[PDB]
Amino acid sequence: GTELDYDTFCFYYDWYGSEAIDGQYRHWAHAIAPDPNGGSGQNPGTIPGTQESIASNFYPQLGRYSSSDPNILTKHMDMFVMARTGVLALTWWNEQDETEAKRIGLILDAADKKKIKVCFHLEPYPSRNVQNLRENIVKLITRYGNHPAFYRKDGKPLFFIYDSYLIEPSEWEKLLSPGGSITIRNTAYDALMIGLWTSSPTVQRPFILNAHFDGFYTYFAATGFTYGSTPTNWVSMQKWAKENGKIFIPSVGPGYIDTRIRPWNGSVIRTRTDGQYYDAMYRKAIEAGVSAISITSFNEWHEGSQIEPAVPYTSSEFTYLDYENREPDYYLTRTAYWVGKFRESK
Template identity: 45%
Template sequence: MVNIQKMARFRLKSCLTLFALASFIFLIIVILKFSIQEASDLPDAFGLEVIPHANRMEKSQNQLQADNATPDTDTKEVNMNAETLLEKYSVPNYNFHTFYYTWYGNPQFDGKYLHWDHPLLPHWDSKVAAAFPKGRHSPPDDIGANFYPALGAYSSRDPTVIDAHMRQMRMAAIGVLAISWYPPGMKDDNGEATDDIVPLILDAAHKYQIRVTFHIEPFKGRDEKTMFDCVKYIVEKYGEHPAFFRYKTKTGKTLPLYYIYDSYLLSPENWARLLNPNAKTSIRNTPYDGIFLALLVEEKHKRAILSSGFDGMYTYFATNGFTYGSSYRNWKSIKAFCDASSLIFVPSVGPGYIDTNIRPWNSQNTRNRIKGRYYETALSAAAEAGAQVVSITSFNEWHEGTQIEMAVPKAGHTAYLDYLPHKPGNYLQITRKWADTFSGE
């Protein structure tokens, strides 16, 4: 009888213990569920919530078309959201520029993929080239990049994509985007003509108080005469738009600013015919005058840029040590040269570099992001050099892995890199953190 009673008490005690444990577990589950729900309701300034249709990459083509048939059905709501964004974030820093590319396309907006299907470029040495794969990429899962965009294999013509880009720039405090530009009817080797996208960019930029300048590419036939024609075209077609960027000089004059990529391909004598105020064909002191920045690659280019009549220089490449101009250790001396020569020095900073998904033989030029430290080192070097204007390489040059645009983890045919353990907007956040450092002209 005693043993039975003891056993009964033991069973009752065990049951009570199990009941208490079960109740405790149930309570924890309820708390966690509530917390998760609460967290999901919180806005994430640099998460995917700020990207319209950010999950489109997981949808079918038919669903994509349905999504974009009326991307923003309530215009008032869209405008309200934009106004809320403008109120939440400080005024853009117009000394923070970023290089921007509009050459991407997809079947929905362009009838085919553009640039995402970039070919693998062969090495110039045929013996080296033979050791690496050939062909081209097959989007949307296999793209010509080492990272994968949060917006998927998007089109640069998609209004929702353009709006998302402007939102990201505004959140990062970027004031000026330098749009990669070819004259009407001209294009790069892997895309289509994009001048007709410029009005879309200007309108969207204006909505977010961002300005637009032009990064003039080395188009076929570029010389002093065709450059004059191009600048004239840009000013006459886009110069009156409120988003068209004008740089305020030390004398108080405001002029359009132009980045001239691969400017060294044209001789100083040719450039002087355009930029020397005493030349008969000079653009100076005409309605089309501007601030012209040359690309500095080699050290000897400093003198050539000065004799050409340029107003300043930039370095573009996001690979520290790749060129004289892109090497951080040289920026102080370059800035000193520019100061002594009354030139503007605009160093180019970037979050890293990797292009092995289009140049598989170029791994030696990869620059690891080191979870954002590489980018901060570049920004710090620009600040220490005394630069007041900085150009960011890039917002969305995905082929070379220099983008600060939001990227997401992606598994599949290609093993893509990502920004983990940070969020997709990590590089926007870093950019915004540094914006106040470069505040004066």
């Protein structure tokens, strides 16, 4: 009851920088978003990413780390082993820069040492469309597909597609129908394509079918943020998935808070309550009878959904939230608990 689960996907962010390694404490410093309902002339400012003031309501046990530091990567992979999360679902922004390329190779290498697998979470990069998506899928499978840590499920790579609704089903069909003009089906570049189910079934069911997605995930850690992230819908979403040959990968998270970077977004806060929120959400995923589960997140520190260890910290600039009556690694060990319960259910 300690082995990795390769149907458990944990969303991982590689965008953190340090002055020493990256030239800037990347992402630890971050713009504060203006209030989308708050009128003109806002000067919301920025979080400077100093030791005292970072762009999170929580504070990492590992400090203001670099995602390109091989020693941090080793520690993260040991944390995945503790959590029993076999798949690292890597945020991918199509930066087309040598620093991205280096980082992806470092992550794959570190993952392989611990038998962790890596798949890609394809983000909404500029001018994203099905043609450049195909080209990027080809590039990723070509560059990384023979890496021993590259994930496959029953012989197929798997990609999560964030904000897949931003692209019309008539475009998706070209890529994802077996008859599509630029199909990946039956090619060397075929993959399980997992789209983001947001809103109501009346909208999302025909979209998933007409776009030829292999499955869907929900992402948001905050319960009730969307229809898809409301766990009382998961039984019915799974029933529909099974009836239509789709893979449902609900996303569970331990809490949510992003008010350092989005001070106006307090309605989305979901309190951790010493792990009871995480337990409730993970239980609903398991009870829905799904084949795979995703975890939002390993380390989206801006959104306060991370399971990565956090420590108490009060600086002159901010009093951070922390894991309260739980130890810093509690969310990793509680993840392992739920992975066990999930496996018992399969």
